[PDB]
Design a protein around this ligand. Structure first.
Ligand code: CA
Ligand code: CA
Lengths: 215, 215
């Protein structure tokens, strides 16, 4: 049982917390499994909805993960890497604004490099209702944090926008930015953003990043 | 000593065959080291000059490598993956036609996925004198061979063009195609090609693919 896809095919069709056994990882891992969207079998790698969890963290916490799979959390890059190294995964991103609208972006192929490659992101095949173009750079960006300046900018994107992300310079997204209750009509530019959906100044209400095998 | 870059910095400035010790590989590996081009320190992952070596091979030979580092060879995907997983590498490709002209393409970032990811290629930052656009797909293609149909085509690119490559459908290159002596004015489309340098019907005289750390 390497992922929520496995969990699903073994007959567990209810979304919720499961434990999975990831190849090459020393200990099992608790994750949230979304079994509802588009046939289910999704492993959630990040979730936000209320701002209870602080995302202003360093490289090591972003690597190992933080938060609680039952609420807001970040799975951790080391884990995302280990899972997406086992086979070929697709990535889906669920987004909601503060006005009741839900949208998604989806990528046919997703993986990231290992820690020595700064967990560099490579994607292909963007579709969805959250913008005609991808708000995540497809073409290559390392992961960056306040203590690891790996972006494609002369500036320091993590310092400017907060959180850990595959910043470009700094690029059209950051789902790990500041949670703002007043996302809609008020600031700022360091919030939870997805440019091609709601723009650079709109901070979103909830996000879920989740992955599953090509099939 | 993980690569020819290490070899070079230890004072070995003469191009030729060296043995390197790649992290996570059970046995040492002989490679050709190019210490001449642009400051040296290049590890050669493929070389062709005379057509003496047959490149029409299956997945396993492409994975483990074939040929002799002193002549024409393919390092092997498992090895390319192991090396490029150690640290961030750039890729440079040296090309010569049959009319005396040499050119190169260069990529700021290079790596490939693991075997379970079909050694998928991801590149960024193409420069050089071998075409204004990259003849290798940057955006994502698995590696394909006659016995592993992983390309982005409905057709079978490896069967049509021969060899093992990151075929698209089938894309603007194949440095592992048929070696033709009569490449300039004669066939064929299944030759050693780099579209943005010489075109799809021109088979090249020599090729060298080589890698080195960003520094
Ligand atoms: Ca920077
Ligand atoms: Ca095909």
């Amino acid at each position: 049982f390497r992922d929520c896809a496995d969990v699903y095919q073994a007959g567990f069709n209810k979304s919720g917390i499961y434990t999975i056994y990831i190849n090459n990882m020393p200990e099992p891992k608790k994750v949230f499994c979304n079994m509802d969207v588009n046939g289910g079998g999704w492993t959630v790698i990040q979730h936000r909805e209320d701002g209870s969890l602080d995302f202003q963290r360093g490289w090591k916490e972003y690597k190992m993960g933080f938060g609680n799979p039952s609420g807001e959390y970040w799975l951790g890059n080391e884990f995302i890497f280990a899972i997406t190294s086992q086979r070929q995964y697709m990535l889906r991103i669920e987004l909601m604004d503060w006005e009741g609208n839900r949208a998604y972006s989806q990528y046919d192929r997703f993986h990231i490099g290992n820690e020595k490659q700064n967990y560099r992101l490579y994607l292909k095949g963007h579709t969805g209702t959250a913008g005609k173009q991808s708000s995540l750079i497809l073409h290559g960006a390392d992961f960056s944090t306040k203590d690891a300046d790996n972006d494609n900018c002369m500036c320091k994107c993590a310092l400017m926008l907060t959180g850990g992300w595959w910043f470009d310079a700094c690029g059209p997204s950051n789902l790990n930015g500041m949670f703002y209750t007043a996302g809609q009509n008020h600031g700022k530019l360091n919030g939870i953003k997805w440019h091609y959906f709601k723009g650079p100044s709109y901070s979103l209400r909830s996000t879920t990043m989740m992955i599953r095998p090509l099939d």
